[PDB]
Motif scaffolding. Structure first.
Motif, PDB file in Angstrom:
ATOM      1  N   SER A  12     -13.002  71.455 -21.210  1.00 45.79           N
ATOM      2  CA  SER A  12     -12.080  70.337 -21.046  1.00 45.79           C
ATOM      3  C   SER A  12     -12.004  69.473 -22.300  1.00 45.79           C
ATOM      4  CB  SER A  12     -12.494  69.489 -19.844  1.00 45.79           C
ATOM      5  OG  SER A  12     -11.586  68.425 -19.631  1.00 45.79           O
ATOM      6  N   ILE A  15      -9.706  70.940 -25.027  1.00 47.76           N
ATOM      7  CA  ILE A  15      -8.293  70.699 -24.756  1.00 47.76           C
ATOM      8  C   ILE A  15      -7.891  69.310 -25.236  1.00 47.76           C
ATOM      9  CG2 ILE A  15      -6.744  70.156 -22.837  1.00 47.76           C
ATOM     10  CD1 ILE A  15      -7.914  72.698 -21.457  1.00 47.76           C
ATOM     11  N   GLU A  16      -8.777  68.325 -25.064  1.00 46.40           N
ATOM     12  CA  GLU A  16      -8.492  66.973 -25.537  1.00 46.40           C
ATOM     13  C   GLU A  16      -8.326  66.939 -27.050  1.00 46.40           C
ATOM     14  OE1 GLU A  16     -11.688  64.594 -24.084  1.00 46.40           O
ATOM     15  OE2 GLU A  16     -10.903  64.474 -22.038  1.00 46.40           O
ATOM     16  N   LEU A  19      -4.861  68.266 -27.850  1.00 47.54           N
ATOM     17  CA  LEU A  19      -3.841  67.310 -27.430  1.00 47.54           C
ATOM     18  C   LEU A  19      -3.757  66.132 -28.392  1.00 47.54           C
ATOM     19  CD1 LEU A  19      -4.095  67.131 -23.527  1.00 47.54           C
ATOM     20  CD2 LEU A  19      -2.191  67.973 -24.911  1.00 47.54           C
TER      21      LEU A  19
ATOM     22  N   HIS E  52      -2.003  62.206 -21.137  1.00 53.20           N
ATOM     23  CA  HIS E  52      -0.574  62.276 -21.408  1.00 53.20           C
ATOM     24  C   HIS E  52      -0.189  61.201 -22.415  1.00 53.20           C
ATOM     25  CE1 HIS E  52       1.035  65.480 -19.044  1.00 53.20           C
ATOM     26  NE2 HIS E  52       0.555  65.021 -17.904  1.00 53.20           N
ATOM     27  N   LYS E  76       4.314  69.163 -22.296  1.00 51.31           N
ATOM     28  CA  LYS E  76       3.036  69.715 -21.877  1.00 51.31           C
ATOM     29  C   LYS E  76       2.919  69.678 -20.361  1.00 51.31           C
ATOM     30  CE  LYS E  76       0.657  70.161 -25.954  1.00 51.31           C
ATOM     31  NZ  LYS E  76       1.950  70.290 -26.678  1.00 51.31           N
ATOM     32  N   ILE E  78      -0.093  69.977 -17.462  1.00 52.71           N
ATOM     33  CA  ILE E  78      -1.538  69.838 -17.333  1.00 52.71           C
ATOM     34  C   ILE E  78      -1.925  70.057 -15.878  1.00 52.71           C
ATOM     35  CG2 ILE E  78      -3.532  68.352 -17.688  1.00 52.71           C
ATOM     36  CD1 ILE E  78      -2.165  66.974 -19.888  1.00 52.71           C
ATOM     37  N   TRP E  80      -5.038  69.482 -13.380  1.00 51.47           N
ATOM     38  CA  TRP E  80      -6.231  68.655 -13.305  1.00 51.47           C
ATOM     39  C   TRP E  80      -7.151  69.112 -12.180  1.00 51.47           C
ATOM     40  CZ3 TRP E  80      -6.147  64.579 -16.944  1.00 51.47           C
ATOM     41  CH2 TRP E  80      -4.895  64.298 -17.500  1.00 51.47           C
ATOM     42  N   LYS E  87      -9.834  68.936 -16.976  1.00 49.77           N
ATOM     43  CA  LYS E  87      -8.609  69.639 -17.334  1.00 49.77           C
ATOM     44  C   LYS E  87      -8.858  71.141 -17.291  1.00 49.77           C
ATOM     45  CE  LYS E  87      -7.058  65.891 -20.357  1.00 49.77           C
ATOM     46  NZ  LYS E  87      -8.315  65.135 -20.103  1.00 49.77           N
ATOM     47  N   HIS E  89      -5.988  73.702 -17.456  1.00 52.53           N
ATOM     48  CA  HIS E  89      -5.044  74.399 -18.316  1.00 52.53           C
ATOM     49  C   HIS E  89      -4.152  73.387 -19.019  1.00 52.53           C
ATOM     50  CE1 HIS E  89      -5.911  77.787 -15.419  1.00 52.53           C
ATOM     51  NE2 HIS E  89      -6.072  78.395 -16.580  1.00 52.53           N
ATOM     52  N   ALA E  90      -3.593  73.811 -20.151  1.00 53.44           N
ATOM     53  CA  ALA E  90      -2.618  73.022 -20.899  1.00 53.44           C
ATOM     54  C   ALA E  90      -1.516  73.969 -21.351  1.00 53.44           C
ATOM     55  CB  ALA E  90      -3.262  72.316 -22.092  1.00 53.44           C
TER      56      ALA E  90
END
Ligand SMILES: CC[C@@H](CO)NC(=O)[C@@H]1C=C2c3cccc4[nH]cc(c34)C[C@H]2N(C)C1
Lengths: 214, 230, 256, 51, 338
Positions: A12, A15-16, A19, E52, E76, E78, E80, E87, E89-90
């Motif tokens: 996780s 991914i941040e 982003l 976001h 995007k 997301i 959750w 998270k 998947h993206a």
């Protein structure tokens, strides 16, 4: 936390990181909205444009800045239901054809709605008047009386062109809004400089308001 | 999906060697990697683990201090550097992929390995060794030293099958879920410290050795194995 | 003198409360977490410390009238807090003016991360330089009087007020030219805003620092009555600072 | 165009309707039966709350 | 026949009005008068999800009441984990102008759409450990407003061309087309039995459709502005709507008329989303005044306020087990209440 739960948290956080990186790269862009009636030189405003129906996007670079252009022309629906998407744009570009009398009194109606919308109270507008040479040759036969019944003056090139510009600029009713006007033909090449000079002035005016002077 | 391992050979004791594994057919950067070795006449044993992004590395107490694991993401290759080899390192080394999120199925794909010749823990017990046995129901049991039920409601038990002259494949993950591309005749259930694997309507291509593994905490431990024969 | 004591009492209370409200307004709203507001937070901290740690203790000094009963605990650290906090106030105004100057002259470049990096650096040098001046005589060599060395009377005075004054006057001179160059209501407001900013800074500090430099260099006597008004003018400047940078912004009012 | 509208109106103008009193009563009875199974109406204790 | 057929339409319209008037004997308020009020409802924020960088336009709950998907203008998607705020998947999007999203009941697919006039379907559970585009549906001449999943191979969409459609994902073709609306279709809601659905348009009307036969059976007109949201009752014999005129209404299928209105003299802003509870006693709505309101569905009495956002609330949602409610707004944050 279990062994599998610790590994999930690690995924996780990666991914941040991606982003956050994507936000920085996308923040160094200038967003512009392209508006105008059909057949008004919207697709030939800048010669160095590259395409990247619904919505059409086009981008180009000048100096060291990235520009993105949006042409909402294929959306033949209620405009008020999707116009709030483009609320963060820097400015609006409006194209007007000087040699098309039928499109007159229709471009004026569209200009009034956009300039007086709730989501565009403090957004500047760049105005382009196209077909400068075609209008001058055509005015010899038609003395501008077909479109505007109330107009007097010797209309060779100048007063007729200055009358149309004043008609468009009369729709502005906001103190924190400005209109930039220019006249171009089909052979002009210095169109990217005009947009660059306008956005530089817009950012200056915004920063004066934060200081409190303007 | 492919995993091809390279290396092996005959090494004198005290030497050094490295093994390589090439991946082709899936997103390599989003998967964790494991090294598992099998002795010529014994079961499976876990060696090392590297996380996605090379941010976490774990080792076994046997090979700590003389084994090194690394990966090369752009080239899609995995390495294992080993020094000060002893006679107890003669085994066949496998490479396993795994991914971790809500609903994932780790240890899903194995790859054919290479043969190398040199010349507080949780105990999982499989009392049965050989079971003589088509068209019948067979039950296999595994036992645990401590409970595998975490406070979040998950039981970390895994089942594997190894056919002769082949590589192990996943059958059951987290003690209740059935892996992809496996017939519904396989079922698994149990409670804390006691687990059972049942097969209904036994047929061909179901003979081999069955292994029970725990994933509650590192290091990971296997079982002795139970062999099914006709 | 009773009325003066009551009047000065409300001055201390207002400065303590108004600056506290600024912190409450900032770290309770998600729209006051931008680059320009980090400079205001630094100024507010330096403003509440003066009203809490310097003004009350200094008020007792004229309450007794001529004596400081505490020997060394309130005659060695009281001076350190007086110099440190007041110097940071002056240098916080300068850091704000420089940020405004570069935003208008260089709008294309001075944005986003570059603006954030430069803004934080200015806060670091605001307190680092102020501590050097405050701790210069204490560590490197009944009346509670500050040092009157001729060398210290120049370094500590020119390097804390006179240098920042030149920067502020020069910066707003160019800003006024830019506002009028682009062009009647808007032009009139531009002159008024700049005049108020400079006038408060000029009025509240120059009379004090003028007599603090001439007295040691040239032997002169000043009655103690004049130094009473001069001292409190500089303290009163920490009351006008939240009245200009926050009250007349049209955005702090909305969050109030 | 006009014929299509008439055909649609005719189809919707011949249906069986029930009284509002029955509709209100049948709507009120459903809520009473499931009152005890609504966490947002009768909050559950913290032991059974997953949030 | 140019003007003679016009008289027939007017006569039939007055015939239906008389039929409904004779069918009304007592109001809902009178019947429910002797019922104990629910009281006051208080809810506290439990989770806040961040990540976001732009406005949030839609969200959808999974059938397991743990997973959810959110769409934003930053291009995007997301997924959750509600319990752990993790998270999963993206998903990057080719077009960043999205307006709707959905989650498949099986949990294997997600869908999205917007101003590109295309509905995209993504595969979640597949080899290679990545999400890929599986199908793009084209054929609409306006922007997509809403989409819902019937099964893993069927989807129903509403667009800005005054037309709804039903697709076959494997074939990629439009099996059935629903026509009859005048204004742009904005909302969509499926019945629990997956046999009927309702829609709201900009002509201030709602319609009931037949999935198998593709015909319109009932039209409800009682509003005065654009209808933005719609939702079925848990029973399946009633539905609620929300419009720009700051008013909610409840309609009955069998009685075929309005039953109750929800309004107050303070609210002047429009309504963006509506939702029911597990029992249907509470009605939740989102407004443009930064707030979410809770109504008593039987007594039309305001019962609570959800105030945790500093921008316009755009989307709502209630879990299948009815344990939590999720709100998304334009401030790039979404919260979970309990
Ligand atoms: C202790 C209070 C009495 C002492 O009689 N007054 C002073 O000397 C204080 C002397 C001061 C002073 C000098 C030299 C440099 C400086 N940088 C900042 C200040 C400063 C602040 C100033 N304050 C207002 C008064």
């Amino acid at each position: 936390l279990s062994a599998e739960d610790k590994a999930a948290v690690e995924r996780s956080k990666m991914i941040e990181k991606n982003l956050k990186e994507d936000g920085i790269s996308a923040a160094k862009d200038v967003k512009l909205l392209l508006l105008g009636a059909d057949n008004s030189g919207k697709s030939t405003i800048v010669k160095q444009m590259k395409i990247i129906t619904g919505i059409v996007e086009t981008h180009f670079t000048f100096k060291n800045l990235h520009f993105r252009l949006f042409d909402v022309g294929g959306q033949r629906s209620e405009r008020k239901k999707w116009i709030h998407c483009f609320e963060d744009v820097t400015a609006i570009i409006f194209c007007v054809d000087l040699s098309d009398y039928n499109r007159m009194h229709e471009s004026l109606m569209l200009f009034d709605s956009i300039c007086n919308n709730k989501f565009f109270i403090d957004t500047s507008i760049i105005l382009f008047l196209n077909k400068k040479d075609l209008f001058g040759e055509k005015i010899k036969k038609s003395p501008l009386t077909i479109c505007f019944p109330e107009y007097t003056g010797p209309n060779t090139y100048e007063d007729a062109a200055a009358y149309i510009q004043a008609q468009f600029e009369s729709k502005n009713r906001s103190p924190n809004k400005e209109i930039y006007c220019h006249m171009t033909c089909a052979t002009d090449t210095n169109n990217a400089q005009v947009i660059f000079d306008a956005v530089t002035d817009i950012i200056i005016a915004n920063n004066l308001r934060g200081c409190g002077l303007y | 999906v492919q995993l091809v391992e390279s290396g092996g050979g005959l090494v004198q004791p005290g030497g050094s060697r490295k093994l390589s594994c090439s991946a082709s057919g899936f997103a390599f950067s989003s998967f964790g990697m494991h090294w598992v070795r099998q002795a010529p006449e014994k079961g499976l044993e876990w060696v090392a683990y590297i996380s996605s992004g090379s941010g976490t590395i774990y080792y076994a107490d046997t090979v700590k201090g003389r084994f090194t694991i690394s990966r090369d993401d752009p080239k899609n290759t995995l390495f294992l550097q080993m020094t000060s080899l002893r006679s107890e390192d003669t085994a066949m080394y496998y490479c396993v992929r795994s991914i971790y999120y809500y609903g994932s199925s780790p240890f899903d794909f194995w790859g054919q390995g290479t043969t190398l010749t040199v010349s507080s823990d949780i105990v999982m017990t499989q009392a049965t060794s050989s079971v003589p046995v088509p068209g019948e129901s067979v039950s296999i049991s595994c036992r645990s030293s401590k409970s595998l039920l975490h406070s979040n409601g998950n039981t970390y038990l895994y089942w594997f099958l190894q056919r002769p002259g082949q590589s192990p494949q996943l059958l059951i993950y987290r003690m209740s879920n059935l892996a992809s591309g496996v017939p519904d005749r396989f079922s698994g259930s149990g409670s804390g410290t006691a687990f059972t694997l049942t097969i209904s309507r036994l047929e061909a291509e179901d003979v081999g050795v069955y292994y029970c593994m725990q994933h509650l905490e590192y290091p990971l431990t296997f079982g002795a194995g139970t062999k099914l024969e006709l | 003198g009773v009325l003066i004591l009551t009047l000065l009492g409300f001055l201390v209370a207002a400065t303590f409360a108004w600056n506290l409200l600024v912190l409450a307004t900032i770290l309770r709203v998600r729209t006051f977490h931008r680059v320009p507001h980090n400079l205001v937070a630094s100024m507010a901290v330096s403003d509440v410390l003066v009203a809490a740690l310097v003004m009350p203790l200094s008020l007792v000094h004229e309450l007794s009238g001529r004596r400081w009963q505490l020997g060394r605990r309130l005659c060695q650290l009281w001076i350190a807090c007086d110099v440190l906090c007041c110097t940071a106030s002056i240098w916080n105004v300068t850091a704000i003016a420089l940020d405004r100057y570069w935003s208008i002259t260089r709008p294309m470049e001075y944005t986003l991360r570059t603006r954030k990096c430069v803004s934080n650096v200015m806060i670091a040098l605001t307190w680092a330089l102020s501590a050097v001046i405050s701790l210069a005589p204490l560590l490197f060599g009944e009346e509670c009087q500050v040092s009157r060395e001729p060398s210290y009377a120049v370094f500590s005075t020119v390097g804390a007020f006179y240098l920042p004054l030149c920067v502020v006057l020069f910066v707003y001179w160019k800003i006024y030219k830019a506002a009028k160059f682009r062009v009647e209501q808007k032009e009139q407001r531009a002159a008024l805003m700049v005049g108020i900013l400079i006038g408060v800074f000029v009025l509240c500090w120059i009379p004090f620092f003028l007599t603090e430099l001439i007295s040691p260099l040239c032997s002169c006597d000043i009655p103690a009555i004049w130094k009473s008004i001069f001292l409190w003018l500089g303290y009163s400047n920490s009351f006008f600072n939240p009245l200009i940078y926050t009250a007349f912004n049209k955005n702090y009012n909305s969050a109030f | 165009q006009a014929r299509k509208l008439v055909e649609q109106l005719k189809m919707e103008a011949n249906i069986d309707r029930i009284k509002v009193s029955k509709a209100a009563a049948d709507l009120m009875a459903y809520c009473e039966a499931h009152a005890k199974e609504d966490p947002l109406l009768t909050p559950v204790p913290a032991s059974e709350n997953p949030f | 026949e140019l003007d003679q057929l016009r008289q027939e339409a007017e006569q039939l319209k007055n015939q239906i009005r008389d039929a409904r008037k004779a069918c009304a004997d007592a109001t809902l308020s009178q019947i429910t008068n002797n019922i104990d009020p629910v009281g006051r409802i208080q809810m506290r924020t439990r989770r806040t999800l961040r990540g976001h960088l732009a406005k949030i336009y839609a969200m959808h709950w999974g059938t397991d009441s743990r997973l959810l998907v959110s769409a934003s203008q930053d291009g995007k998607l997301i997924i959750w984990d509600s319990y752990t705020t993790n998270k999963v998947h993206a998903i990057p999007l080719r077009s960043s102008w999205v307006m709707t999203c959905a989650y498949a009941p099986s949990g294997n697919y997600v869908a999205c759409g917007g101003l590109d006039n295309i509905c995209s379907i993504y595969n979640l559970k597949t080899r290679e450990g990545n999400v890929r585009v599986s199908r793009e549906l084209a054929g609409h001449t306006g922007y997509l407003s809403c989409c819902r999943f019937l099964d893993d191979n069927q989807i129903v969409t509403s667009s800005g061309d005054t037309t709804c459609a039903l697709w076959d994902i494997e074939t990629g073709q439009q099996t059935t087309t629903f026509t009859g609306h005048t204004g742009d279709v904005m909302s969509l809601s499926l019945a629990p039995d997956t046999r009927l659905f309702v829609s709201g348009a900009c002509d201030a009307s709602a319609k009931l459709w037949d999935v198998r036969e593709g015909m319109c059976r009932q039209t409800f007109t009682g509003h005065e502005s654009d209808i933005n949201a719609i939702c079925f009752f848990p029973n399946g014999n009633a539905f609620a709507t929300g419009s720009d005129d700051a008013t909610c209404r409840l309609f009955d299928l069998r009685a075929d008329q309005e039953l109750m209105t929800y309004s107050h003299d303070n609210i002047i802003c429009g309504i963006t989303s509506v939702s029911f509870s597990k029992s249907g006693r509470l009605l939740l709505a989102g407004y443009d005044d930064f707030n979410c309101n809770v109504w008593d569905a039987l007594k039309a009495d305001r019962a609570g306020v959800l105030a945790g956002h500093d921008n316009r609330v755009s989307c709502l949602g209630v879990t299948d087990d009815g344990m939590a409610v999720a709100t998304g707004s334009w401030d790039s944050f979404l919260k979970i209440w309990n």
